[PDB]
Ligand binder design. Structure first.
Ligand SMILES: Cc1oc(-c2ccccc2)nc1CCCc1ccc(C[C@@H](C(=O)O)n2nccn2)cc1
Ligand SMILES: Cc1oc(-c2ccccc2)nc1CCCc1ccc(C[C@@H](C(=O)O)n2nccn2)cc1
Lengths: 255, 254
């Protein structure tokens, strides 16, 4: 029933709002919108970073400090996604090991997805949107550290061309979470059952919310390939970094 | 409109039949014992391979894959030209689309000739076991296994040739290929192709919920298979310096 699908869609939207502080709506307004109330601090070079470190406080080489800050934010994002996942109908009733498996393999795909919401072609909103770090400044960090954000920007530019909103993304990230092809899964059936229902909800959502955008559903699904490729090359970029940035309690938090 | 999309489905099925002489319908008939077709000779060890070679082994098998891949590129190229709007695209983009599409198509269609236990070879005259392929010398016993693992999952979708004709068309017309000059005419064609796939799947598989979505997600599997495979070919290039990729395949890889 369309009624049940639209019910599922609104439920996911409501939970997404409750779980993620900085939404796309709020981030687009900050980046370029009729919001001129407050203004992010711009970080475009080394001096502005130092300047940004004193005013806004972050709760040793510059390129390393930035890397570690990304790790801290990554860890915060995991917990927000984890909370969101619990609201997806059926999710908590899955085998406990499968829940952990889906989250483990899914978080990065979602992190890169939602990061696009905070990006344009020229930079990324940082620290709850109190800041703005430029694409150029990130490009110039060093020999290993100057490459990890560029692929994310490249994906975002393309992904953002789809012009999805929060209500669209809520269902999309749920589809991502309930993938039955994650390795080590024990009971693939109810996962695929839920994803099929989420997929139906996403399709109707896109058809109602973007009636003039032909085949948007298909094109969104095709992006999942871009995401998986980006996750894979990221872990690959981290293995090389591990052989440069060669605290024991900190390395536990960031395993 | 329904009618226009159905007419597109038929045209692509028609050209598929004309371009690919070993179809999935035929492959299944050979693999399951149907009387429409004849049973293959089975290659499972060195001696059966020796007995089979009427109509180094690891190398010979590897070259057999090369010739078959080259033959496949040719058939895919013939098929592509039938895709409405494809030949009217910038020539450089035609080359680019073929360059990045062929292998994804090859591994897709190779599943049609596979079951959990092996693969049809030499136009269905032969059947080479999965196990025999693993037993090959260290740099050659690796390349087939992930194709099998893909095939076992891809085959679970139960697509037939008329489904595959459209899906492969969708693959060729990907606007996201590296170095494309005019993305928009390509994406306009793929959009019409995707609509045609969607309707085909829902008419041909009415009981199969979100098959369209599940099929598209398989393109992720394909792209990883290509990447894995390239890395594996680089190993072989460095070990066997007396050996040579086919020029057509050399040109494609880059
Ligand atoms: C580029 C950037 O810099 C800051 C930032 C920098 C200094 C202070 C506060 C925030 N926030 C951002 C936004 C990017 C957020 C972000 C979140 C997660 C990840 C993946 C994360 C991971 O591997 O899980 N990672 N840690 C290090 C490198 N990659 C990468 C990037
Ligand atoms: C396993 C097998 O053996 C024979 C065969 C063996 C001896 C004589 C004739 C055919 N045909 C097959 C099935 C073809 C499977 C197949 C087809 C294409 C490709 C890709 C092809 C490529 O990379 O273009 N390749 N060449 C070498 C390794 N990979 C990889 C594998």
């Amino acid at each position: 029933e369309s009624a049940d699908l639209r019910a599922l869609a609104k439920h996911l939207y409501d939970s997404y709002i409750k779980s993620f502080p900085l939404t796309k709506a709020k981030a687009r307004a900050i980046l370029t919108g009729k919001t001129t109330d407050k203004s992010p601090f711009v970080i475009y070079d080394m001096n502005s970073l130092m300047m940004g470190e004193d005013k806004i406080k972050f709760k040793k080489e510059v390129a390393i400090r930035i890397f570690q800050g990304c790790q801290f934010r990554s860890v915060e994002a995991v917990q927000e996604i984890t909370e969101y996942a619990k609201s997806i109908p059926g999710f908590v009733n899955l085998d406990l090991n499968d829940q952990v498996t889906l989250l483990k393999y899914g978080v990065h795909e979602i992190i890169y997805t939602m990061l696009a919401s905070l990006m344009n072609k020229d930079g990324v909103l940082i620290s709850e949107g109190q800041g703005f770090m430029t694409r150029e400044f990130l490009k110039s960090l060093r020999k290993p550290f100057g490459d990890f954000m560029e692929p994310k920007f490249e994906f975002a530019v393309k992904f953002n061309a789809l012009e999805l909103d929060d209500s669209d993304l809520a269902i999309f990230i749920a589809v991502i979470i309930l993938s039955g092809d994650r390795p080590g899964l024990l009971n693939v059936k109810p996962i695929e059952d839920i994803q099929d229902n989420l997929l139906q909800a996403l399709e109707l959502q896109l058809k109602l919310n973007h009636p003039e955008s032909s085949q948007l559903f298909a094109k969104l699904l095709q992006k999942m390939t871009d995401l998986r490729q980006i996750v894979t090359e990221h872990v690959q970029l981290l293995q090389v970094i591990k052989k440069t940035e060669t605290h024991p309690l900190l390395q536990e938090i960031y395993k």
